Design a protein around this ligand. Structure first.
Ligand code: PRO
Ligand code: PRO
Ligand code: MH2
Ligand code: MH2
Ligand SMILES: [Mn+2]
Ligand SMILES: [Mn+2]
Lengths: 483, 477
């Protein structure tokens, strides 16, 4: 069957991937005792947008649930799936004749049927008549809360939908659960997004020079991903933090726009990931700007490497993800004590939540069509109300097919360090005579993407993440070179 | 005073630029007989957005009117201007402590006052209290219709605004008219955006090879503009049309996403422009993929070059922009007739609107903060209901300080050609036996950005646009 492909060395993605997702969704809904016979899933695709009131078009990127079910890149579509039969119908806009002058060929409905391997294609303005003819019992629309944004997924609507019975509660938890477990075809795409992003990270590490602006490397990363990977989008705005900016977890946004000059002795923390056909990647490489770790930089880096490796070695089905976060905390505290930054009982440090001073974010998150992917907190899975752990994007137990980031880090964040020094329950663990030397260090994060298997994990990422590999990469060594 | 700068060789833009815009706006409002003493202009900045219901942040780009007035890059702000005194007050978000962990330094109000050279800075949550203290007669908010999108500019709102008298009709035409006329400081930025975009077009022309995907050149263009020019955004989605796609005027969007392989013998039409600090550029280069014009490609190309140069040379204050569009039409028809595609009286072809078959779009448009900049059709300026001219984005007469694109083109668009061939009033002019050789040609567009001066124009763009220049650039010369 047909495939999405951007030529050259880019990945061919079979449209069968989306047919399987639809099949899996129907199979799950058929098992759901509350789903009525004759139900139809109704999804509304994204629409094209402009900047504010101007006619400046914004490049259209499909809504993620609609993409997951259909793989459709055109704006203005709807899509329906008959639960009982699995039959799929794509609704496409009826375009004006002038479209052929300004925007491109006005493809036939049959063109879209063959392109997307759906069972039927109709025009959007006929949706009410088409659905009436199918005599559905209930329309299942999409409404629910994203647990990272807090936003409500807005459900499909069309003129005449009020004449149908509409249920907007069943579908969201079910399609979310389908998205949590990646198919073999989806894993091929996530292997590819990690491959290209890993290559781009290596090119960035080879290119960094003292005196460059952070955004020069953002630009290079995105250029590699697009020109060599066909990744028109990134999965999120590139985080290119040098020096003290490496302690700012989502640095690089419009208010702090990757505009610092890289200086000798700085650590760089580059958290970047290209997106291919709406599939994410998320990789973080930390490294010295000048290509040579100092003793202090090596020690911090090695501490995060130890926690990364311990978590990856422990991950398997049945493991509770908060336990991995606590494991990383304990290891960071142990290693910071071995460095002389902390002293005393690590057991007592953990009770005082001292780990969250150095790692205020979650250990890692589901990844998929969204970089912070859906399904981390389904009903009954509670957020843990403690420093650090409350920022975890899931508190689930690991199961085969989940895709997670593993991204421990250690940072030197002045307001968190000063809070600890003002708190009698935490202050005594800090050795200011050594800590002072790490003020303004920034931080280190080591992030890889992994798949939970039947017995452990598969590593998707291939970047230089040991001290020796990093120094070798920055010295221009071939990838195949093993220091 | 302070300047916006992204380091390296990027342009330092003085924040005085925006102070001058605020002063010019107040000067216009003070002359408006409907404006009451004690009025305050209230603008609302753009807010950060995410992809649909996800937490995936969209890179924030400021709303154009707010940028024009204040130059502010942070989301979530408001800005007000006392009309009588010109005093400016910026309102910034009061950020939570966690901002320092996740997003960066929590700058003080004094930092923002120094950065933006405004008279006062307050927190957004104080806007109602601050404005109440000033006892305004009326708040002037922004509402009006963009004549390219048809969308309504949404006016500022804040908690408590219902307690004030609000006027939402006066401001839009006045701030639009100020944007139409670029200051010398604005022109310096548009010279720079054209400089970097021109350099990037040259790099793209040198890099094009048969067998590449169109999007490889989109990527290179944007990489040059960002890494070398500090242009994090483009002014619009890059149009990288090869072969038949060069006849698709806004090719490159998500439904036709620059995904064709460039083939030997194809024409390329690359319409791309980087954006620096929310100032646009818009440049188009057309050229043969293999670096050598065929006779047919050269003839089409030189026809568009002729109209490009004729229009630029005729532009001066007082010229009616529709006349320039018709001038390009007439030249195209003359040249297509010389090539044997057309036959008969060019005067009669013009009366039949045949030029619009080959150039269905407007000759060019205002350019500024937005690539299709505001103010093309103020009240009293009417759109001309004829093929081609109806797509003109302004029907104004030219005046000094206006910034225009000049972008004639000739395209071979099947449905327009076929409609003309069905019409006995136009079919006689077309020679099917010659036209058939140009079916699937695509098209040629040549675009320059210019400023109207007291005596003529100043050309901002510097790209290879003669056949000799193009072939030399592409041969690695
Ligand atoms: O948002 C998160 O969960 C991770 C933490 C570091 C940056 N991204
Ligand atoms: O939209 C416009 O007015 C011009 C015509 C060709 C592409 N841009
Ligand atoms: O977390 Mn990247
Ligand atoms: O027209 Mn660009
Ligand atoms: Mn991540
Ligand atoms: Mn233009």
């Amino acid at each position: 069957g047909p495939s999405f492909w951007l030529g050259n060395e880019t990945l061919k993605v079979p449209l069968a991937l989306f047919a399987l997702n639809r099949q899996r969704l129907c199979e799950r809904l058929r098992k759901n005792p509350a789903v009525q016979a004759g139900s139809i899933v109704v999804l509304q695709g994204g629409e094209e947008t402009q900047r504010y009131c101007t006619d400046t078009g914004v490049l259209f990127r499909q809504e993620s649930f609609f993409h997951w079910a259909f793989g459709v890149t055109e704006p203005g579509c709807y899509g329906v799936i008959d639960v009982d039969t699995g039959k799929s119908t794509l609704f496409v806009p009826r375009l004006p004749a002038s479209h052929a002058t300004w925007m491109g060929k006005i493809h036939s409905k049959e063109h879209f049927k063959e392109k997307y391997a759906v069972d039927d294609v109709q025009y959007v303005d006929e949706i009410a008549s088409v659905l009436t003819s199918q005599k559905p019992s209930v329309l299942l629309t999409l409404r629910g809360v994203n647990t990272d944004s807090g936003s409500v997924c807005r459900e499909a609507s069309f003129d005449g939908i009020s004449k149908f019975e509409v249920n907007n509660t069943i579908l969201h938890p079910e399609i979310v659960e389908c998205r949590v477990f990646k198919t073999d075809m989806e894993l091929e795409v996530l292997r590819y997004t990690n491959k290209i992003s890993s290559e781009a990270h290596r090119e960035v590490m080879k290119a960094v020079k003292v005196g460059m602006k952070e955004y020069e490397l953002e630009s290079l990363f995105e250029h590699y991903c697009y020109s060599r990977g066909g990744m028109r989008h990134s999965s999120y705005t590139c985080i290119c933090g040098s020096g003290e900016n490496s302690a700012v977890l989502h640095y690089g946004h419009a208010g702090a726009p990757n505009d610092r000059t890289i200086q000798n002795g700085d650590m760089c923390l580059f958290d970047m990931g290209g997106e291919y056909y709406c599939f994410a990647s998320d990789i973080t490489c930390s490294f010295p700007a000048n290509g040579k770790f100092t003793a202090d930089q090596k020690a911090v880096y090695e501490a995060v490497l130890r926690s990364s490796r311990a978590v990856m070695g422990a991950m398997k089905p049945g493991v509770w993800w908060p336990d991995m976060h606590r494991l990383a905390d304990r290891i960071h505290l142990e290693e910071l004590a071995h460095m002389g930054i902390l002293s005393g009982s690590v057991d007592a440090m953990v009770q005082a939540h001292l780990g969250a001073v150095f790692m205020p974010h979650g250990l890692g998150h589901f990844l998929g069509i969204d970089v912070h992917d859906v399904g981390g907190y389904p009903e009954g899975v509670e957020r843990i109300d403690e420093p650090g752990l409350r920022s975890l994007r899931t508190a689930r137990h690991l199961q085969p097919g989940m895709v997670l980031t593993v991204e421990p880090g250690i940072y030197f964040i002045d307001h968190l360090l000063d809070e600890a020094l003002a708190d009698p329950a935490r202050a005594s663990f800090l050795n200011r005579e050594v800590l002072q030397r790490f003020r303004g260090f920034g931080g280190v994060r080591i992030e890889e993407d992994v798949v939970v298997t039947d017995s452990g994990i598969e590593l998707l990422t291939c970047v230089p993440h040991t001290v020796e590999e990093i120094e070798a990469c920055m010295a221009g060594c071939d990838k195949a070179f093993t220091p």
